């Protein structure tokens, strides 16, 4: 088996009334160091795997579309549209 | 590429325009047409923001690199890739394709209307279309005549 004599004596026995004040200075360093590792790689990383999908699949995150047709007015000089909604699809391929 | 083969050349007078419709249509035509260089101005701004504080509270010139090139790279993920940016130039292309396939026959025929145009602006008072008055004429006959 194992003799963990001391580290169950110590399991058993130990200070309810005992702690230590923290540097804030030191805990807010480490915890910014940690912060630097986070963001940087870890959002390179993630970015990667969110906007991959969004780079070589656009269609799926625009579903509709607009398009035109335009017809003139010539006594004021104006152009006139009207307009339709498609579904954003593959056109010609 | 079709639909900007089909327009040579986009004026900024002709964005503007649809700006009415949708606006930073000039941003979305920056992001996918490579008409200048996108320099990340917010990301460059928010690294010297962030100079400004590693100056007073002194951190190494090595975190002051470090947290200029973090926001810059920022703004660049968030600017390059926006494929949504694409569409928006899509729908752009296609109404400006319109516009000007219109404006083109205003010209063309510009001459031949000279004569009906001046009784027509000194008797109808009206910036309404032509379009839009004849279908507001149509409706109204439809609703209230002897019929
Ligand atoms: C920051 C607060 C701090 O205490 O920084 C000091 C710590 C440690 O700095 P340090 O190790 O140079 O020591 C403290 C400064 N002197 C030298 C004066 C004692 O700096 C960092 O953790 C670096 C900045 C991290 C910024 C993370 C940004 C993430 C993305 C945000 C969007």
Known sequence: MLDDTKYIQMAQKFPRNVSVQLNKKLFVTRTW??????????????????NQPKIFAPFSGYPTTVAYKAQPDFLNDQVIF???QRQNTLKNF | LRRKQQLGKIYPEEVSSYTQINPDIANDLNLTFNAKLLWPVRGMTVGAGFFAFAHLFNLPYSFRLGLFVLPTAVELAFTWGNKTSQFKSIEFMDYLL?????????????????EKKAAYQKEINSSQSVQDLYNQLITLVSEQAPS
């Open chain 1, 82 to 84: 009207y307009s339709q």
């Open chain 1, 33 to 50: 160091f940690r912060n630097y590792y986070f963001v940087g790689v870890f959002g390179i990383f993630a970015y990667f795997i969110y």
């Open chain 2, 98 to 114: 319109q516009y000007r396939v219109s404006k083109a026959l205003l010209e063309k025929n510009a001459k031949h209307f000279a």
